[PDB]
Amino acid sequence: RGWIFGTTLDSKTQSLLIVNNATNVVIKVCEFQFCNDPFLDRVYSSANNCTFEYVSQPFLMDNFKNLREFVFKNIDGYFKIYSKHTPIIVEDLPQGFSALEPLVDLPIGINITRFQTLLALH
Amino acid sequence: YNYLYRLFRKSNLKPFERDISTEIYQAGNKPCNGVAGFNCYFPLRSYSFR
Ligand SMILES: *[C@@H]1O[C@H](CO)[C@@H](O[C@@H]2O[C@H](CO)[C@@H](O)[C@H](O)[C@H]2NC(C)=O)[C@H](O)[C@H]1NC(C)=O
Ligand SMILES: *[C@@H]1O[C@H](CO)[C@@H](O[C@@H]2O[C@H](CO)[C@@H](O)[C@H](O)[C@H]2NC(C)=O)[C@H](O)[C@H]1NC(C)=O
């Protein structure tokens, strides 16, 4: 449903938080404290230093496995996210061609070196 | 002293980047291990605006 981006991912320094809730999307750059295996039903704990937030319409809409492409890129604080959705008939990345519309840019202003995906158990 | 500032850091800053972490500074070949001392500078000092 989302990702965790950061250079430390250890609540010592800033680490953004993203989620595709069935109701919306929520991105907050706080000194979040997670657990060893964070998944939604509670993913975080003890939200500290909450400095930036964003909530809008959720990201992912709906035999064919749906493909969702994203380009996560950061320039001079402006973290750029691109959105794409495409149905795929039933693995292998589909050899073809398409483009990605931009979706949103946010001025988080953090140092990012690693990123870990937020996944659900089942 | 509501306002403070940084003067020592391992590397300079990035455009539109606000470095905020309170990490002890090592100015010498020896580490600091999170304890004040020689080559152990708290990253932030305060101005005496008088
Ligand atoms: C994040 O919140 C923490 C509180 O848990 C802040 O901690 C103190 O903040 C004051 C603000 O002037 C500092 O003087 C203290 O040295 C901080 N102490 C500790 C133990 O962190 C922290 O400053 C906040 N960070 C930001 C960027 O606002
Ligand atoms: C953002 O974080 C990265 C990861 O630590 C920094 O890259 C390191 O910088 C230190 C000096 O501060 C070097 O000693 C390391 O060799 C660098 N590589 C690593 C560990 O990734 C990067 O410098 C940080 N951004 C800025 C502007 O300093």
Side-chain angles (χ1 to χ4, degrees), chain A residues 1-8 11-12 14-18 20-27 29-42 44-122, chain B residues 1-6 8-50:
Chain A
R1 315 182 187 274
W3 299 265
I4 290 294
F5 287 77
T7 176
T8 189
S11 305
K12 302 285 110 177
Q14 277 300 341
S15 298
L16 57 80
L17 168 55
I18 302 181
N20 187 44
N21 299 338
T23 70
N24 49 5
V25 54
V26 63
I27 310 94
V29 175
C30 320
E31 292 291 340
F32 276 106
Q33 169 54 27
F34 328 88
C35 48
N36 195 270
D37 274 344
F39 53 103
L40 281 304
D41 188 10
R42 72 150 173 253
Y44 75 100
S45 63
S46 183
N48 178 28
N49 303 112
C50 274
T51 61
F52 173 75
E53 79 95 1
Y54 178 86
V55 173
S56 61
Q57 211 268 334
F59 281 8
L60 301 172
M61 307 302 108
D62 298 324
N63 42 15
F64 306 151
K65 310 163 186 170
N66 301 18
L67 177 63
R68 38 215 53 173
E69 307 201 347
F70 310 101
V71 187
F72 306 118
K73 175 187 166 188
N74 47 348
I75 288 297
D76 70 0
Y78 270 113
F79 190 92
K80 290 201 173 182
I81 316 102
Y82 295 78
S83 68
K84 183 65 178 184
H85 192 289
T86 307
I88 289 307
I89 304 176
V90 195
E91 293 177 350
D92 192 15
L93 277 170
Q95 184 253 318
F97 215 86
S98 290
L100 275 76
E101 292 84 343
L103 193 278
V104 73
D105 191 340
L106 300 180
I108 56 172
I110 66 178
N111 187 347
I112 302 178
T113 309
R114 316 171 64 179
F115 86 103
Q116 187 179 4
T117 189
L118 296 178
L119 78 169
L121 67 167
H122 65 263
Chain B
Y1 295 92
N2 292 121
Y3 315 91
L4 303 86
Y5 66 107
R6 178 198 322 264
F8 287 159
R9 183 55 188 170
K10 296 205 306 179
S11 53
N12 300 342
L13 298 193
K14 192 70 60 173
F16 296 101
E17 166 54 43
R18 177 168 53 246
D19 184 16
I20 71 165
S21 203
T22 66
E23 308 305 319
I24 200 62
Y25 184 72
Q26 167 194 326
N29 309 330
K30 311 167 184 176
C32 281
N33 313 319
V35 173
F38 78 102
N39 310 350
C40 304
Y41 306 85
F42 189 79
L44 313 169
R45 279 49 55 97
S46 193
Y47 286 117
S48 73
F49 284 137
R50 318 183 175 270

